[PDB]
Amino acid sequence: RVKKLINSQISLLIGKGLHEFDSLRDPEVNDFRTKMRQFCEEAAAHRQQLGWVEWLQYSFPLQLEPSARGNRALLVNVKFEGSEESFTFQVSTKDMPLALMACALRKKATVFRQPLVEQPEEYALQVNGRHEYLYGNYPLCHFQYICSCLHSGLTPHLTMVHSSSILAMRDEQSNSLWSLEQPFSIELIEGRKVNADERMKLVVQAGLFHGNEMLCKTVSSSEVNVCSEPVWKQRLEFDISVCDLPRMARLCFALYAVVDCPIAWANLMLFDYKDQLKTGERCLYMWPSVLLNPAGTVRGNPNTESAAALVIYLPEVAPHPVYFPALEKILELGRHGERGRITEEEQLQLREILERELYEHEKDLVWKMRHEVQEHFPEALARLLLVTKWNKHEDVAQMLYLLCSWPELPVLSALELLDFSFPDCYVGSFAIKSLRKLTDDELFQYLLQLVQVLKYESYLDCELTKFLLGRALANRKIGHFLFWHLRSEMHVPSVALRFGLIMEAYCRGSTHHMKVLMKQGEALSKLKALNDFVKVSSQKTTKPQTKEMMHMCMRQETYMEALSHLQSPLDPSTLLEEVCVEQCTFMDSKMKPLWIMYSSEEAGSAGNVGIIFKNGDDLRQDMLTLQMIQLMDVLWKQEGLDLRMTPYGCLPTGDRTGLIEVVLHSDTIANIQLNKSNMAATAAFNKDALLNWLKSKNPGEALDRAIEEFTLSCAGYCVATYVLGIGDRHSDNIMIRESGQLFHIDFGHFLGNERVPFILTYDFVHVIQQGKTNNSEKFERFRGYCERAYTILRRHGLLFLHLFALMRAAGLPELSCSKDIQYLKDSLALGKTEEEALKHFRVKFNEALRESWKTKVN
């Protein structure tokens, strides 16, 4: 009964019935399902037996300040679970949670006149009405929650949770090739269901690829007249022996009409998932184009009824099955050869290119010196993997002999190896091996890219999937975001099977978390139906009329139940308790997004949270932009610079659907600049508006801190939008917080899409200068923040480039070519010394001040 129940709940949550994986009768899907179910159920068993602190590390992973992972006194209100009563203690920032625990326990002993059996060690500190905890040996200032409280001046509210109450949570949450010298060849039989102009002819272009690099030149078929069912029945002979074909070789096709006109493409892996070379007839269910697409999926289009179908024939090269030689035979072949006997002058020339795109002779020097590359320049592995002739088996074996004895490389170097430019399974396997040392916070930071890399994968059962599942089942937040990255792409036919299969495997490993996520999905189901109603309604009547009707709809028990008592998909730590129907509304833009507010008596002031549900637009690019700004913030803070950034949440959840985090106490620059009457912010000059509003919100001494907050966030956003090429910036997509904090919203365009200049808006220069026409003391202190922030990002120039290259797998239109990646290389001026790039930045900063000074004049 329960086995049947779990499957039906998995089918509903993943957004595809489990029976549909079975109907494929594909042994690759069936072997993935049994192997990963077993792998996931082991993690489940390991977890259900963890210690109580180890359970806190899984369920409530520490949220530490970027400064700690690698005095000033304060009031903290502490209480005990089974009591409404609480005590406020004066503590220090330098103090550990345990000192506060033993403190909380002394006052409870005096209040109850009993010398308490318990020790501070037995308890943990929960943030009031949040799935957040404060434990480990870290001062209060090192926790993201205490640090936050110190800037908004607020008192931290904590609850003492006993070890027995945590274990209660743990318990309630239970579950031979190299002797085939003949040239490679296929028989292109015919084409099916093709749709093209009857005037033209159909040509099939096939190509053999090892990622982006061609194994041999391309070949085109004979020009056969346009008709629905074209016929060829001709041999295609490639310029490569069947002995020379690498394990990860993909045969690519491109059907196209000509008098050029793309129609469809399709790719397949020449070797199956059991290392066996493929034989027999092959029907290719084609994907529609807009010619050769090597990066595209190697699985056929699921829509067999409408899609084009080319019939090929991989012939029997031998009378018995042929497998790719095992590692033991590979390492034995590559074990033989001559080392690099190079003179001091060529060793200097080698050091020049290995520390530096290179000429043909320069690739010959890397290859000869492949042992000195391994020995003295191991971090130059990727450059050596690029010089390898992946169309020669002896060359691949010599290379794969060095890779098996290659020392582990840093996380930075491992991320580059994950690229499609490195298609070898042993190279990919080596990348995950060097990525294991990634901490949970770093893995969280790069989890979006690692999920997109799943789209480059040639087979279902892979190291990257087992790695992502392993880390996801060891950490409930990683698991949370892994699920939503997969769930949000189920509508895309090319990944739906892969992604469907990963979530099922996850769900097997966490039955309780599937139930938690089903609750998020039920809430998002209601929000879609309500948002649709608002779209239709706003077209038929006034905003108060639609708002009231949204409120009536929300007040239905079905809605009240589905929309309340959940974990936020934006942040699993945030609990969305009682839905505040009176505060819910909708935005007046094209997609009419929903503004949903929540309150929690258990969480108090911190439990006033809201989420925005937006349906109609792809939100993935916003998310990427936001994650990139957040990374900058993390990087700046690791160098001691806090630019008071607002890296608010944005998470795609489904088809052109997702969530945006509400920042309360903020309004857009435009709304403030409206300069309305009978308000505190009303101005004598419109340039006074932002400043007047910062004054109204910040009385007395407080105003100076708001001007500083503005200056810091501004400098951070001026740099963030310049490096990322964020354009279409106006007063409607620029916001200000009551604390003085400036931040940007709605990122529709990045990376030029051409050559976006640095912008200094005189409205924000007027606040920086404290309303003074000239204030060089304050203006140049802001230029210093821009510079420092700019020169810190350049030091991690290789990281953003490594991350943005991986994001090319996402299929975002503004991230589709090397022109987009080049944009970042120019914005960070990576091909320059720190001096040159700085002088250049100043040229562009002064170019922006001259442009700002246009308004200043009037």
Contact residues toward ligand OKO (CB under 6 A) are: 585, 587, 589, 591, 593, 595, 612, 614, 619, 622, 648, 660-663, 666-668, 745-746
- CB nearer to ligand OKO: pick between 745 and 821: 745
Strand pairing category for 657-661 and 609-615:
antiparallel
- In the complex, the smallest distance separating the C-beta of residue 563 from ligand OKO, rounded to whole angstroms, is 17
Rounded CA-CA distance 372/167 in Å is 54
Of 418 and 810, CB closest to ligand OKO: 810
Helices and strands counted in the chain (H then E): 31, 27
The CB density around residue 781, as the number of other CB atoms within 10 Å, is 14
Q: Least distance in Å: CB of 722 to ligand OKO?
A: 20
Q: Amino acid identity, residue 250? A: R
Supply the minimum distance, in Å, between the C-beta of residue 734 and ligand OKO. 10
Q: Tell the smallest beta-carbon distance from residue 552 to ligand OKO (Å).
A: 19
Q: In the complex with ligand OKO, which residue's Cβ is closer, 420 or 595?
A: 595
Nearer to ligand OKO, 182 or 589 (CB): 589
- Cβ at position 323, least distance to ligand OKO in Å: 50
129 neighbors 577 (Cβ within 8 angstroms)? yes
Could you tell me the two tokens for 474?
A: 């060891």
Pairing relation of β-strands 73-80 and 157-162? parallel
Choice between 397 and 735, CB closer to ligand OKO: 735
Of the two residues 460 and 735, which places its CB atom closer to ligand OKO in the complex?
A: 735
Which residues of 525-602 form beta strands (DSSP E)? Answer: 566-567, 575-576, 578-579, 585-586, 594-599
Give the amino acid at 446.
Y
Least spacing, CB of residue 668 vs ligand OKO, in Å: 5
Contact 268, 251 (CB under 8 A): yes
Nearer to ligand OKO, 185 or 668 (CB): 668
Nearer to ligand OKO, 479 or 649 (CB): 649
Residue 728 Cβ vs ligand OKO, minimum distance, rounded to whole Å: 11
Compute the least distance from the CB of residue 554 to ligand OKO, in Å: 15
DSSP string, 689-720: HHHHHHHHHS-TTHHHHHHHHHHHHHHHHHHH
Cβ proximity of 686 and 855 under 8 Å: no
Closer CB to ligand OKO, 419 or 622, in the complex:
622
Residues 6 or more apart whose CB falls under 8 angstroms from that of 402 comprise: 334, 370, 371, 373, 374, 384
* Closest residue to ligand OKO using C-beta atoms: 589
What's the one-letter identity of residue 497? L
| Alpha carbons 269 and 545: distance in angstroms, whole number | 58
To the nearest whole angstrom, how small is the minimum distance from the Cβ of residue 649 to ligand OKO? 9
Query: Residue 614, Cα to own-chain centre: how many angstroms?
Result: 19
Residue 2, Cβ density class (10 Å: 0-12 exposed, 13-18 middle, ≥19 buried) = exposed
Minimum CB separation from ligand OKO for residue 646, in Å?
A: 9
Concatenating the DSSP letter of every residue in 784-838 gives HHHHHHHHHHHTTHHHHHHHHHHGGGG--TTSSSHHHHHHHHHHTT-SS-HHHHH
Nearer CB in complex with ligand OKO: 618/688: 618
Q: How far is the CB of 666 from ligand OKO (least distance, A)?
A: 6
Cβ at position 720, least distance to ligand OKO in Å: 15
Query: Residue 653 has what DSSP assignment?
Result: E
290: Cα separation from own chain's centroid: 26
Q: Quick one: 353 or 587, whose CB is closer to ligand OKO?
A: 587
Q: Which of 479, 473, 430, 414 is nearest to 451 (CA)?
A: 479
Give the DSSP H/E element, type plus range, for residue 300: none
What residue type is 182 in one-letter code?
Answer: Q
Q: Which is nearer to ligand OKO, 159 or 653 (CB)?
A: 653
